[PDB]
Ligand binder design. Structure first.
Ligand SMILES: NCc1ccc(C(F)(F)F)cc1
Length: 330
């Protein structure tokens, strides 16, 4: 079987993408953030403390005939940006774009951090990293992808994120009409539980391609592109008036500047990120300083190929016994 669901940016800057997901019987539809950088499916629920809920749609397990409390199970997760959430665990039926999994662990948030509360468009997260990162104790739980794997025609899902436009998450098949040319596959390391791979180099604008190995993760749940300091300095040096700002927390540039493209390597292939994708608009309303979409990973400890990079490509997450990542121009 297969599934296909439209994903939509939550705002005008593509800060995140939400995808409708059906949970329970009868269906309760929540808009979840599909995150290949984590492995927990957690949702706002009727159990979330009332003051930490501001406009989100909430999962009510008491209204679902298929919901079962997973007795004794708890979860606690903390994301690389400082966000956190925790609660108890139910099992229920979960459907994405026609693809249905029964008995999926649905982690009910009893407490959520302030950043989730103030984001009324995101009802929860659907983790798509490897199940070894799942935070349910004492019995670790499988992701939606892992539970669906056997029934999928092919053990793959694809991310086709749009630039200021809706996109598509497909499960079980590769849409050969969604990309141009060939798909270039590259090996994945699952040692840290991420979709971790090695880029073969980069280029700035129309400059020479620098062959160098960049280890990083493919993370749909991260907005920006986080690369080593040497690469990020070489990019922003080509933008008149750009500078790293300690008060803002990254590179900013005059909103009047035009940005060069950024090319990253996938084996022998090249993926070009148009310069417009790197503009994240004024740092504050009315400001003439704009925030850059390529930032340093030095403070993070791992390089992150976030939405800025992934939306420039058709990306195949191949969850075969030997996992691989496929990249294609589109
Ligand atoms: N989007 C999930 C996510 C967030 C942060 C990290 C970090 F910071 F640990 F790299 C990995 C994955």
């Amino acid at each position: 079987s297969t599934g296909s669901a439209t994903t939509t940016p939550i705002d005008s800057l593509d800060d995140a993408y939400i995808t409708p997901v059906q949970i329970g019987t009868p269906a309760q539809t929540l808009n979840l953030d599909f995150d290949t950088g984590s492995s927990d499916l957690w949702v706002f629920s009727s159990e979330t403390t009332a003051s930490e809920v501001d406009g989100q749609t909430i999962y009510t397990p008491s209204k679902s005939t298929t919901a079962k409390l997973l007795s004794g199970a708890t979860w606690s997760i903390s994301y690389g940006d400082g966000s956190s959430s925790s609660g108890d665990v139910y099992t229920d039926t979960v459907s994405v774009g026609g693809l249905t999994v029964t008995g999926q662990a649905v982690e009910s948030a009893k407490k959520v951090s302030s950043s989730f509360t103030e984001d009324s468009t995101i009802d929860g997260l659907l983790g798509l990293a490897f199940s070894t990162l799942n935070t349910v104790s004492p019995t670790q739980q499988k992701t939606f992808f892992d539970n669906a794997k056997a029934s999928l025609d092919s053990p793959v899902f694809t991310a086709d994120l749009g630039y200021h436009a809706p996109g598509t998450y497909n499960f079980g098949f590769i849409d050969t009409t969604a990309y141009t040319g060939s798909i270039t596959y590259t090996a994945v390391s699952t040692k840290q539980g991420f979709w971790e791979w090695t880029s073969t180099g980069y280029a700035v604008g129309s400059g020479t391609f620098k062959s160098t190995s960049i280890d990083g993760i493919a993370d749909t749940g991260t907005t920006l592109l986080y690369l080593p300091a040497t690469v990020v300095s070489a990019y922003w040096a080509q933008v008149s008036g750009a500078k790293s700002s300690s008060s803002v927390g990254g590179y900013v540039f005059p909103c009047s500047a035009t940005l060069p493209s950024f090319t990253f390597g996938v084996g022998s292939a090249r993926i070009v990120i148009p310069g417009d994708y790197i503009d994240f608009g004024p740092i504050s309303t009315g400001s003439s300083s704009c925030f850059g979409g390529i930032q340093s990973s030095a403070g993070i400890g791992i390089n992150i190929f976030g939405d800025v990079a992934l939306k420039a490509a058709f990306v195949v997450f191949n969850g075969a016994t030997t996992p691989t990542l496929g990249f294609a121009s589109k």
